[PDB]
Short mmCIF file of C-alpha atoms in Angstrom, two decimals:
data_model
loop_
_atom_site.label_atom_id
_atom_site.label_comp_id
_atom_site.label_asym_id
_atom_site.label_seq_id
_atom_site.Cartn_x
_atom_site.Cartn_y
_atom_site.Cartn_z
CA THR A 11 83.24 81.34 83.74
CA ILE A 12 84.98 84.79 82.60
CA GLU A 13 84.53 86.03 86.13
CA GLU A 14 87.05 83.30 87.01
CA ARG A 15 89.69 85.85 85.66
CA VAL A 16 88.79 88.60 88.06
CA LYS A 17 88.06 86.56 91.16
CA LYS A 18 91.59 84.77 90.43
CA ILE A 19 93.68 87.89 89.64
CA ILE A 20 92.10 89.86 92.71
CA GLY A 21 93.74 87.10 95.09
CA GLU A 22 96.96 87.06 93.27
CA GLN A 23 97.06 90.76 93.62
CA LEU A 24 95.85 90.68 97.28
CA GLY A 25 97.31 87.63 98.81
CA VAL A 26 93.64 86.14 99.61
CA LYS A 27 92.34 83.09 98.03
CA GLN A 28 89.37 82.84 95.66
CA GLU A 29 86.74 82.61 97.81
CA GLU A 30 88.43 84.96 100.61
CA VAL A 31 86.67 88.18 98.83
CA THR A 32 83.23 88.98 100.07
CA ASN A 33 80.90 91.03 97.42
CA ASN A 34 79.74 93.30 100.46
CA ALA A 35 83.39 94.25 101.59
CA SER A 36 85.63 97.11 100.26
CA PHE A 37 89.08 96.65 99.07
CA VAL A 38 90.10 99.66 100.40
CA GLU A 39 89.85 98.87 103.98
CA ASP A 40 88.39 95.62 104.22
CA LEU A 41 90.72 93.76 102.12
CA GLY A 42 94.06 95.57 103.53
CA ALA A 43 94.94 96.69 100.17
CA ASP A 44 96.16 100.50 100.58
CA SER A 45 96.19 103.05 97.70
CA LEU A 46 99.04 101.52 96.11
CA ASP A 47 97.91 98.12 96.29
CA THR A 48 94.38 99.11 94.78
CA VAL A 49 96.17 101.06 91.95
CA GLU A 50 98.19 97.89 91.20
CA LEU A 51 95.05 95.52 91.30
CA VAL A 52 92.91 98.08 88.94
CA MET A 53 95.94 98.02 86.81
CA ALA A 54 96.51 94.34 86.72
CA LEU A 55 93.02 94.05 85.76
CA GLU A 56 93.54 96.56 82.96
CA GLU A 57 96.39 94.42 81.67
CA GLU A 58 94.71 91.09 81.63
CA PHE A 59 91.62 92.25 79.66
CA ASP A 60 93.71 94.20 77.21
CA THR A 61 91.60 97.22 77.77
CA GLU A 62 91.71 100.88 79.27
CA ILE A 63 90.10 102.27 82.27
CA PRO A 64 90.31 106.15 82.86
CA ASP A 65 91.01 107.37 86.27
CA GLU A 66 87.40 108.62 86.98
CA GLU A 67 85.72 105.06 86.25
CA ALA A 68 88.80 103.37 87.81
CA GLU A 69 88.15 105.03 91.18
CA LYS A 70 84.71 103.54 91.27
CA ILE A 71 86.00 100.08 92.10
CA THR A 72 86.25 100.22 95.80
CA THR A 73 83.76 97.42 96.29
CA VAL A 74 84.50 93.85 95.58
CA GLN A 75 81.67 93.50 93.17
CA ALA A 76 82.46 96.69 90.99
CA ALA A 77 85.48 94.52 89.57
CA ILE A 78 83.03 92.33 87.57
CA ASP A 79 80.14 95.07 87.12
CA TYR A 80 82.39 97.09 84.80
CA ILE A 81 83.81 93.94 82.96
CA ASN A 82 80.64 91.95 82.00
CA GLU B 15 102.58 117.07 62.64
CA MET B 16 99.70 115.95 64.48
CA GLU B 17 99.58 112.50 62.71
CA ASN B 18 103.17 111.98 63.98
CA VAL B 19 102.25 112.84 67.39
CA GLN B 20 99.49 110.01 67.00
CA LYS B 21 102.09 107.73 65.89
CA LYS B 22 104.09 109.05 69.12
CA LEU B 23 100.87 108.10 70.73
CA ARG B 24 101.17 104.57 69.46
CA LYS B 25 104.93 104.43 70.61
CA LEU B 26 104.21 105.54 74.04
CA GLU B 27 101.37 103.09 74.25
CA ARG B 28 103.53 100.25 73.76
CA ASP B 29 106.11 101.30 76.22
CA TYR B 30 103.12 101.76 78.81
CA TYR B 31 102.28 98.18 77.97
CA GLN B 32 105.85 97.07 78.80
CA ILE B 33 105.81 98.93 82.06
CA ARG B 34 102.47 97.40 82.90
CA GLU B 35 103.73 94.04 82.76
CA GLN B 36 106.73 94.89 84.87
CA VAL B 37 104.64 95.89 87.50
CA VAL B 38 102.31 92.93 87.55
CA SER B 39 105.03 90.44 87.45
CA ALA B 40 106.47 92.23 90.52
CA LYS B 41 103.71 92.01 92.52
CA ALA B 42 103.26 88.16 91.89
CA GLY B 43 106.52 87.89 93.76
CA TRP B 44 105.91 90.51 96.45
CA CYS B 45 103.05 88.25 97.32
CA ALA B 46 105.12 85.07 98.08
CA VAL B 47 107.95 86.96 100.05
CA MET B 48 105.43 88.87 102.67
CA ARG B 49 103.91 85.44 102.78
CA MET B 50 107.07 83.79 104.17
CA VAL B 51 108.31 86.89 106.03
CA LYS B 52 105.12 86.53 108.41
CA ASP B 53 107.58 84.65 110.76
CA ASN B 54 108.14 87.69 112.92
CA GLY B 55 110.91 88.84 110.76
CA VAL B 56 108.82 91.72 109.00
CA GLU B 57 107.40 93.07 112.24
CA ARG B 58 110.47 95.09 113.04
CA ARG B 59 113.79 93.17 112.11
CA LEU B 60 113.67 93.31 108.30
CA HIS B 61 111.39 96.34 107.81
CA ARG B 62 113.83 98.95 108.74
CA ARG B 63 111.81 101.76 107.67
CA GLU B 64 114.41 104.20 108.30
CA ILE C 17 107.62 119.13 101.54
CA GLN C 18 111.18 119.88 101.57
CA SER C 19 111.01 120.62 105.48
CA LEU C 20 109.04 117.58 106.24
CA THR C 21 110.96 115.43 104.17
CA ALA C 22 114.43 116.55 105.63
CA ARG C 23 112.70 116.03 109.20
CA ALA C 24 111.32 112.64 108.51
CA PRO C 25 114.22 110.19 108.88
CA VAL C 26 115.19 111.38 112.28
CA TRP C 27 111.74 111.19 113.74
CA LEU C 28 111.45 107.75 112.27
CA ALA C 29 114.82 106.53 113.84
CA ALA C 30 113.48 107.93 117.05
CA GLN C 31 110.39 106.34 116.90
CA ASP C 32 111.88 102.80 116.27
CA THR C 33 114.18 103.16 119.08
CA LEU C 34 111.17 104.41 121.47
CA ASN C 35 109.00 101.50 120.42
CA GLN C 36 111.40 98.92 121.18
CA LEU C 37 112.36 100.61 124.41
CA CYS C 38 108.63 100.81 125.76
CA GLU C 39 107.85 97.37 124.44
CA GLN C 40 110.87 95.86 126.32
CA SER C 41 109.27 97.23 129.37
CA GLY C 42 105.62 96.45 130.83
CA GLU C 43 104.24 100.12 130.61
CA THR C 44 103.73 102.23 127.43
CA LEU C 45 105.13 105.70 127.20
CA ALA C 46 103.33 108.62 125.72
CA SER C 47 105.24 111.97 126.74
CA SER C 48 108.29 113.29 128.19
CA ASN C 49 107.04 113.64 131.76
CA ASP C 50 105.58 110.05 131.53
CA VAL C 51 109.25 108.83 130.70
CA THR C 52 110.40 110.84 133.83
CA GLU C 53 107.95 109.37 136.10
CA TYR C 54 108.65 106.08 134.77
CA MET C 55 112.46 106.73 135.54
CA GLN C 56 111.47 107.41 139.36
CA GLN C 57 109.27 104.07 139.43
CA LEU C 58 112.77 102.16 138.18
CA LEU C 59 114.69 103.89 140.80
CA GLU C 60 112.29 102.55 143.60
CA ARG C 61 112.57 99.34 142.33
CA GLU C 62 116.31 99.32 142.44
CA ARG C 63 116.31 100.42 146.07
CA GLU C 64 113.79 97.54 147.04
CA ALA C 65 115.50 94.78 145.24
CA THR C 66 119.00 95.88 146.53
CA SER D 22 97.43 113.67 74.86
CA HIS D 23 95.33 111.06 73.40
CA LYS D 24 91.93 112.89 73.99
CA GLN D 25 93.63 116.22 73.08
CA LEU D 26 94.87 114.60 69.92
CA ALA D 27 91.23 113.39 69.17
CA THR D 28 89.83 117.03 70.06
CA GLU D 29 92.43 118.50 67.79
CA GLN D 30 91.49 116.12 64.84
CA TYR D 31 87.93 116.82 65.21
CA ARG D 32 88.78 120.77 65.38
CA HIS D 33 91.35 120.41 62.47
CA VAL D 34 88.08 118.63 60.53
CA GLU D 35 86.01 121.54 61.02
CA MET D 36 88.67 124.32 59.97
CA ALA D 37 89.39 121.99 56.61
CA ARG D 38 85.65 121.72 56.00
CA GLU D 39 85.29 125.80 55.99
CA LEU D 40 88.34 126.06 53.82
CA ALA D 41 86.76 123.53 51.46
CA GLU D 42 83.68 126.03 50.89
CA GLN D 43 86.07 128.85 50.39
CA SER D 44 88.07 127.01 47.90
CA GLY D 45 84.48 126.39 45.95
CA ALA D 46 83.67 130.03 46.49
CA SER D 47 87.10 130.77 44.97
CA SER D 48 86.54 128.78 41.71
CA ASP D 49 83.16 130.39 41.38
CA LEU D 50 84.62 133.88 41.90
CA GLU D 51 87.43 132.98 39.21
CA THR D 52 84.64 132.18 36.72
CA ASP D 53 82.71 135.30 37.79
CA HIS D 54 85.91 137.26 37.15
CA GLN D 55 86.72 135.60 33.91
CA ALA D 56 83.35 136.95 32.89
CA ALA D 57 84.29 140.15 34.25
CA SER D 58 87.61 140.40 32.33
CA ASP D 59 85.56 139.52 29.40
CA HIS D 60 82.83 142.42 29.90
CA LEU D 61 85.86 145.06 30.37
CA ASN D 62 87.11 143.95 27.02
CA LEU D 63 83.71 143.93 25.36
CA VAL D 64 83.20 147.62 26.80
CA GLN D 65 86.70 148.83 25.64
CA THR D 66 85.85 147.16 22.18
CA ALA D 67 82.24 149.11 21.93
CA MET D 68 83.64 152.38 22.86
CA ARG D 69 86.10 152.01 19.83
CA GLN D 70 83.34 151.25 17.55
#
């Protein structure tokens, strides 16, 4: 469904496939994306949904599941 | 004066929008190159971090 | 930050050469004294093989 | 700057509101002062009579 956006974009931003990401893991260390890569991921998510996410809320996406939690 | 700064905010917002497309489109290609480069080139030969 | 930035490139070049050198050998170096002792072991192997 | 502008607009609206009250008070005072000027002329007239 609409989550297909996130679970797609994440992979396109991290080089992993759609099913590679696990909800329990964390982007910062368990996916290999460093600070710059995570900034790029969150900002691409911002672009895709034509919305805005301030720094404080944006910093709360270190886990895989959060990417949908703030979305839906 | 402040309404012109608001309209400045709108102009700056569209500039930000442009920059954002640039960034995401660039990463899409970085992905592919770093996929192919893993044939031992990136290890130390191409990645001349100096 | 200016001091660190001026210093950085030299340290990085030195590290690349060091990594190449020790990886070329079987043993991994960690200090000046360590490099010296490796010199001595190298001399002993010279004078046996000869 | 966006949030500052939003906060400055909220402050601007508050200063505009208090001046609207003083503008009304000025019109009431103008009405009272018109009556005051009339009262002075009425007293000057009474003194002459």
